[PDB]
Amino acid sequence: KSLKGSRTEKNILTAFAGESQARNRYNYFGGQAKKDGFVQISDIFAETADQEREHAKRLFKFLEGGDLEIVAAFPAGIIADTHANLIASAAGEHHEYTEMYPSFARIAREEGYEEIARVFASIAVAEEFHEKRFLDFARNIKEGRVFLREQATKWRCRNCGYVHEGTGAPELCPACAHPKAHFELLGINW
């Protein structure tokens, strides 16, 4: 069934508008993280931005055309330090997966748009992990554990792949000479 005139139609566009702004905000926060010396976090912001582009794309492809008026609130700014940006990003994700998407999914099911309702629910899952990632990094910054841990571990240079073993990432990579900012905890997800 068509979406024309349905509340779901406006909800999809509203989600698209929000996801679109989130993509820009995350890319900006990614640039700020770079300036603040947090390369892994910067790349995480950029990856999240690209994933928001994909949520938006799925939503956009459901629309049938024409201009549609929407009424919604969005974050008017701002770009602060990385810790603050991570906190603000997490808060935005929280609202999306706890309030917005469940509401949109609910209304979709009500109006008879099952496929779309399920897509809203699925996107909410992605947003929750996005929040987890942001909250975890904010915590690392607050606890001063971004580049230092209590026990010896392995740190990988994102720039060249050098692996450093120790309680903390080195001031400079011994292989590529790039600063500590490029190091992350060595991760294996395969």
Q: Is 111 annotated for ligand binding? A: no
Other C-beta atoms lying within 10 Å of the C-beta of residue 169:
23
Residue 91 or 185: the one with the smaller Cβ distance to its own copies is 91
Residue 11 or 140: the one with the smaller Cβ distance to its own copies is 11
Determine the 3-state secondary structure of 98 from DSSP: helix
Q: Is 130 annotated for ligand binding? A: yes
- The answer to whether residue 70 forms part of the interface with its own copies (CB under 8 A) is yes
Report the Cα 122 to chain-centroid distance in Å. 15
Beta bridge partners of 166: 153
Contact 33, 92 (CB under 8 A): no
Of 141-180, binders to Zn ion (CB under 5 A) are 157, 159-160, 162, 173, 175-176
- Find the length of the chain: 190
Determine the 3-state secondary structure of 150 from DSSP: strand
Q: Is 19 annotated for ligand binding? A: yes
- Binding site residue list for Fe(3+): 19, 52, 93, 96, 127, 130, 157, 160, 173, 176
Contacting positions for its own copies (CB under 8 A) = 9, 12-13, 16-17, 19-21, 23-25, 27-28, 53, 56-57, 60-79
